[PDB]
């Protein structure tokens, strides 16, 4: 009974205080130029002390969770939160509540060993140079995370959970002749051990295949198919940040007064909700202990509403809906999403290809890029990008798209039928999107 | 003799391996918009092998330093080397060397406690508001950490050293009309807790009061005072690396055959020293246990050669400089820098910008900014910087500057008094330096 003790304890110098316990086991492993580079076992501890005395706030943080050093950091945090000046905006902790139904944990995760990682890139070089001989992984990593959290505060929440993930990635390059092709990327991420090592190289490989035959691009108007990664990297520095209640609170979102508006195609919906059946991360509540839920923020095109932690959601009225992320170097709450989800269609990405009469596949913005979320607007590189004619790639091309992402998400004719997870960044659960001809410079 | 019997025990997989164990204890504290946000302590230990078999290398990481962990990284090292393929220009490890003699430990900085550190970040928002009231510490950091490493091989090298550093920096921001400054950086480190927080805020703040007054900038020609920030920037990104002797193996180093060639005005000595008396870390031996020395670069404007560690130096044919370190996310070794000094002049900063008729001091480089190591080639927008007339500052600007930091280095005309050690990228130490008729783009 360590914890309760522990609160007790603090609430001899705090008007309230929440303590937050994060564990962690992770696993990595990684090749550079065709060699295993790297095994990796790591492990540990982390306790967090958020206290709050006549509204001044004190965190402070350790790398233990033995009771002694927990004490040590509420004394740290408490002498903190008297050299502090008050926050007025400040209104309290969150409340219990009433959590959706813990999932049953992937235990296999918590104690994989890092030859599983070291065998999988093996088989992934090997592999790779199988389907093509000039191939070389120049790069590539796979990792398991395990993690626990339990999460308390001075009015009687308790949450804990713990869960793992998986995920690999390689960067596949290719010579035929004397063309080298761009570093060529491809990942896959799960809940399990049985990382798709092969679907990555076939992927992989395929794309350099295509990328052996570089055709030039011109200034036209064109059908662009963007895939998960190039969705993930647009939407979360131009379109994501605007549904953050933090920035209605200062007029910073151009979605403020658009709630029942149509800022995208009816094709596009878009929610955020860990029990998503792909989801890395299904946490049944969010850093702070606030319930998850499933928060839809674009119903068939419609602007739905904001996200919100504890904090903002206070200081403007309303209820936190879950969104309340543990930032990883300073120990304080920010809003953010948990796992991204952009609803699927009925077709393959194959059938969609197919009708195409001249158009690109954008799988990446590797390139110069510009973003500005208070009003959407954008400027990046379509690479790598292939050149689709009469229904067929014909090789990689080069262009810069610029443009606004409503704009943009307004010329949305269709989705794919598959998802994928992008663990990266902001975990995002998303298929392909079709948008219609979209105007780019060669 | 814990680790004597490790090694034997590696030495039935391998031919050859090294055991690094690496400690340490951090704490650090930080400021968000006058408020202390956070203080941390943090402490760990972590062992690396390097094992080789029929020139077969395996890495393995663990964190901790108990033996039993250790014996299993070392079998985790083994099988990855029997995975791996055989590196033909691999050669061997380090051999036993004389080492210099060792400093006595800063101990202090051993147990800090971060109650230290946040009584400076007050003291530093009380003196910001009490020299102009509208300067707001918009954020801010200072950190102390104590390392140590033991490094050994199955050759005999043994080699063990401790020691600590601390730094502060804080960014402040001025609003007087309807202008708000850009943030002004300043920051202090050294190898005790007398941080001095008092010249951080009067250099900050003073800075402040010259961007209240911004002054539009034209295309020119003029004469340009680099601060040890800029140049920091500025040649870790764009000169430095041309000194690799691995740039040099793989023909990507505009330095290829020019030892003895001036690269820069005569004006400007350049060396790697880790025991010059301002250095943070005064290390006898480089990640890999090869003994350390003072390396110079450049003497009076001539290029004297090029930096090493073992691999590449043996596939060359020379021998480690001492500059193999540690990678921080791989565990390999990597060529790197200890303390690169730029050697002081004879006048101090003040007398230097009294003779300047028109001319600008750089403070920063913040802003858009692309570099070529390969050639030397930069395009920095200078910002903070600060526009001199008639041996006055004048005000605030934002300009242009692109070109080859070695047509720069033929410009140097002088270096000031005072050497400030740079704790951020390449620790650097280093003076203001005065560029004579630099072209500048408004």
Same mark, same amino acid.
């Given at each position: 009974?360590?914890?309760?003790?522990?609160?007790?304890?603090?609430?001899?110098?705090?008007?309230?205080?929440?303590? =937050?316990?994060?564990?962690?086991?992770?696993?990595?492993?990684?090749?550079?130029?065709?060699?295993?580079?790297?095994?990796?076992?790591?492990?540990?501890?982390?306790?967090?002390? $958020?206290?709050?005395?006549?509204?001044?706030?004190?965190?402070?943080?350790?790398?233990?969770?033995?009771?002694?050093?927990?004490?040590?950091?509420?004394?740290? /945090?408490?002498?903190? =939160? +008297?050299?502090?000046? !008050?926050?007025?905006?400040?209104? *309290?902790?969150?409340?219990?509540?009433?959590?959706?139904?813990?999932? +049953? !944990?992937?235990?296999?995760?918590?104690?994989?060993?890092?030859?599983?990682?070291?065998?999988?890139?093996?088989?992934?070089?090997?592999?790779? $140079?199988?389907?093509?001989?000039? =191939?070389?992984? /120049?790069?590539?990593?796979?990792?398991?995370?395990?993690?626990? $959290?339990? %999460?308390?505060? *001075?009015?009687?929440?308790?949450?804990?959970?713990?869960?793992?993930?998986?995920?690999?990635?390689?960067?596949?390059?290719?010579? +035929?002749?004397?063309?080298?092709? !761009?570093?060529?990327?491809?990942?896959? /991420?799960?809940?399990?051990?049985?990382?798709?090592?092969?679907?990555?190289?076939?992927?992989?490989?395929?794309?350099?295949?295509?990328?052996?035959? %570089?055709?030039?691009?011109?200034?036209?108007?064109?059908?662009?198919?963007?895939? !998960?990664?190039?969705? =993930?990297?647009?939407? *979360?520095?131009?379109?994501?940040?605007?549904?953050?209640?933090? $920035?209605? %609170?200062?007029?910073?979102?151009?979605?403020?007064?658009? %709630?029942?508006?149509?800022?995208?195609?009816?094709?596009?919906?878009?929610?955020?909700?860990?029990?998503?059946?792909?989801?890395?991360?299904?946490? #049944?509540?969010?850093?702070?202990?606030?319930?998850?839920?499933?928060?839809? @923020?674009?119903?068939?095109?419609?602007?739905?509403?904001?996200?919100?932690?504890?904090?903002?959601?206070?200081?403007?009225?309303?209820?936190?809906?879950?969104?309340?992320?543990?930032?990883?170097?300073?120990?304080?709450?920010?809003?953010?999403?948990?796992?991204?989800?952009?609803?699927?269609?009925?077709?393959? @990405?194959?059938?969609?290809?197919?009708?195409?009469?001249?158009?690109?596949?954008?799988?990446?913005?590797?390139?110069?890029?510009?973003?500005?979320?208070?009003?959407?607007?954008?400027?990046?590189?379509?690479?790598?990008?292939?050149? #689709?004619?009469?229904?067929?790639?014909?090789?990689?091309?080069?262009?810069?798209?610029?443009?606004?992402?409503?704009?943009?998400?307004?010329?949305? *004719?269709?989705?794919?039928?598959?998802?994928?997870?992008?663990?990266?960044?902001?975990?995002?659960?998303?298929?392909?999107?079709?948008?219609?001809?979209?105007?780019?410079?060669?």
């Amino acid at each position: 009974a360590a914890m309760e003790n522990l609160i007790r304890f603090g609430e001899k110098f705090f008007d309230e205080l929440e303590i =937050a316990v994060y564990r962690s086991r992770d696993i990595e492993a990684s090749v550079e130029l065709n060699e295993i580079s790297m095994a990796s076992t790591r492990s540990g501890a982390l306790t967090i002390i $958020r206290g709050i005395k006549d509204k001044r706030l004190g965190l402070a943080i350790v790398d233990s969770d033995e009771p002694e050093k927990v004490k040590e950091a509420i004394e740290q /945090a408490a002498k903190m =939160a +008297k050299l502090n000046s !008050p926050d007025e905006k400040w209104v *309290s902790l969150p409340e219990p509540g009433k959590y959706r139904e813990k999932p +049953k !944990p992937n235990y296999e995760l918590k104690e994989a060993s890092p030859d599983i990682l070291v065998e999988k890139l093996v088989k992934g070089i090997k592999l790779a $140079r199988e389907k093509d001989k000039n =191939a070389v992984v /120049a790069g590539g990593a796979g990792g398991v995370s395990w993690e626990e $959290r339990h %999460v308390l505060n *001075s009015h009687g929440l308790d949450v804990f959970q713990e869960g793992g993930a998986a995920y690999m990635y390689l960067e596949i390059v290719g010579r +035929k002749g004397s063309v080298v092709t !761009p570093g060529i990327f491809d990942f896959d /991420a799960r809940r399990d051990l049985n990382l798709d090592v092969e679907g990555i190289v076939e992927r992989a490989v395929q794309k350099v295949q295509w990328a052996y035959n %570089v055709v030039p691009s011109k200034n036209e108007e064109v059908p662009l198919i963007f895939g !998960p990664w190039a969705i =993930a990297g647009l939407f *979360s520095y131009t379109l994501l940040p605007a549904f953050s209640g933090e $920035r209605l %609170v200062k007029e910073t979102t151009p979605l403020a007064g658009k %709630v029942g508006e149509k800022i995208a195609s009816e094709v596009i919906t878009l929610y955020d909700d860990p029990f998503h059946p792909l989801s890395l991360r299904p946490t #049944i509540a969010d850093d702070e202990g606030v319930p998850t839920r499933k928060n839809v @923020l674009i119903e068939n095109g419609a602007f739905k509403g904001f996200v919100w932690d504890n904090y903002w959601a206070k200081i403007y009225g309303t209820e936190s809906t879950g969104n309340g992320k543990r930032d990883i170097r300073s120990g304080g709450i920010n809003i953010g999403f948990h796992s991204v989800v952009i609803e699927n269609g009925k077709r393959s @990405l194959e059938d969609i290809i197919g009708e195409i009469d001249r158009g690109y596949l954008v799988d990446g913005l590797q390139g110069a890029h510009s973003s500005n979320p208070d009003n959407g607007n954008f400027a990046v590189t379509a690479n790598p990008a292939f050149l #689709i004619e009469d229904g067929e790639v014909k090789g990689s091309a080069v262009f810069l798209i610029a443009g606004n992402v409503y704009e943009l998400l307004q010329q949305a *004719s269709e989705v794919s039928k598959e998802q994928t997870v992008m663990p990266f960044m902001n975990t995002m659960i998303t298929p392909h999107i079709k948008f219609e001809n979209v105007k780019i410079a060669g």
